[PDB]
Design a protein around this ligand. Structure first.
Ligand SMILES: CC(C)[C@H](NC(=O)[C@H](C)C[C@H](O)[C@H](COCc1cc(F)cc(F)c1)NC(=O)c1cc(C(=O)N[C@H](C)c2ccccc2)cc(N(C)S(C)(=O)=O)c1)C(=O)NCc1ccccc1
Length: 373
């Protein structure tokens, strides 16, 4: 039932959203980072200074060794480990047990985060980007094939320490407002989508829309920032720079390298532009927009000052719509229908005079031109 899953995510601010799970017999309780940018289910199986518990394969009567090794690199860190299957369930999720692939993590490099409170990762993207190859069934596929849980999940990530909901197997209407707008998943590997226009405070950025998806645009609950290709990152920074030139910033701030602060309660939100991403819609020549507030891309970092880090950053692997984008929104991963839906969420962040928004329809000729091949 849906209400039982509402508020099943937690997290320390800047440190990820995790859901509670159990692996084994008898069940061992672990916190798992919820990650739509990858496809491997993996937990700490070995003492690590940043970890407070870990999976112990020898305490489980249902563990099965797979006698195959694995390694998974992310933008920001990596780990290797030993594959195997075991029984798994989600306390605050659907009321089932499945046998799934689990990577037992034995060494890692900049992957676990100090004091984050999660010991593992749930990659919810598709088989094709699974390691070591697409034959390792991802958790969610196993979940669907072995139960009657419909092939769909939704994420409401609340920022504003950090909380939210993962509704597994449907949509809870009491968590968003207005209507859901859908964008096709272009290809089932990452959650790849096509961005057809970008505006900053109502001004078209006027780049060739191939640039917005060079070389892909993905939706990713595992990455903090809105990450943009070099060309797009530079046009954006130049605009945001010019809209808030009223104020004083060391330019390593623009690079995410230092903070800016303000006498508490005086942050000048008004000089930071709203950003609109226009996504491919579901019908010919049709798109829609989602608009984020500066409260989403200036993240409060923990004096009686308010300090913020700039959370838009460069990438050479295409656009990443990370938690900065997703925290405004109720995001539906309709795998069954190959689409991703957005609505303003209930826990939306609050400007005095401006609102995070999902709006349509819009006309956009030549949307197919926008995909990079
Ligand atoms: C297996 C495959 C699908 C893999 N997937 C990915 O890399 C996707 C895009 C990234 C994942 O979402 C991956 C999974 O998240 C786990 C993680 C947490 C870490 F602290 C460190 C890590 F290394 C990893 N996330 C990140 O790489 C990542 C995490 C963070 C980050 O801070 N994440 C935390 C947990 C967080 C905080 C708040 C909200 C959500 C998440 C930040 C970044 N940035 C780059 S940034 C500064 O925001 O621009 C990236 C991939 O594509 N690899 C390609 C590759 C190969 C070799 C080398 C580099 C890249």
């Amino acid at each position: 039932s849906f209400v039982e899953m509402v508020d099943n995510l937690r997290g320390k601010s800047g440190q990820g959203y995790y859901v509670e799970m159990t692996v084994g017999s008898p069940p061992q309780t672990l916190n798992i980072l919820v990650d739509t940018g990858s496809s491997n289910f993996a937990v700490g199986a070995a003492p690590h200074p940043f970890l407070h518990r870990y999976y112990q394969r020898q305490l489980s009567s249902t563990y099965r060794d797979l006698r195959k090794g694995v390694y998974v690199p992310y933008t920001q860190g990596k780990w290797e480990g030993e594959l195997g299957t075991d029984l798994v369930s989600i306390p605050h999720g659907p009321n089932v047990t499945v046998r799934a692939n689990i990577a037992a993590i034995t060494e890692s490099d900049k992957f676990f985060i100090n004091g984050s409170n999660w010991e593992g990762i749930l990659g919810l993207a598709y088989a094709e980007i699974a390691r070591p190859d697409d034959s390792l069934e991802p958790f969610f596929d196993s979940l669907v094939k072995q139960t009657h849980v419909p092939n769909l999940f939704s994420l409401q990530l609340c920022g504003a320490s950090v909380g939210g909901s993962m509704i597994i197997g449907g949509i809870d209407h009491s968590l968003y407002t207005g209507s859901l707008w859908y964008t096709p998943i272009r290809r089932e590997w990452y959650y790849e989508v096509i961005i057809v226009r970008v505006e900053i405070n109502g001004q078209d950025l006027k780049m060739d829309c191939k640039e917005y998806n060079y070389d892909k645009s993905i939706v990713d609950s595992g990455t903090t920032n809105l990450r943009l290709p070099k060309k797009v990152f530079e046009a954006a920074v130049k605009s945001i720079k010019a809209a808030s030139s009223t104020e004083k910033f060391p330019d390593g701030f623009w690079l995410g390298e230092q903070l800016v602060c303000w006498q508490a309660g005086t942050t000048p939100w008004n000089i930071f532009p709203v950003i609109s991403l226009y996504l491919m819609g579901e019908v010919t020549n049709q798109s829609f927009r989602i608009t984020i507030l500066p409260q989403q891309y200036l993240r409060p970092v923990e004096s009686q000052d308010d300090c913020y880090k700039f959370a838009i950053s460069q990438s050479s692997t295409g656009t990443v719509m990370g938690a900065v984008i997703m925290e405004g929104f109720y995001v539906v991963f309709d795998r069954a229908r190959k689409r991703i839906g957005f609505a303003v969420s209930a826990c939306h962040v609050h400007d005095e005079f401006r609102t995070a928004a999902v709006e349509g329809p819009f006309v956009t000729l030549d949307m197919e031109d926008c995909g990079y091949n």
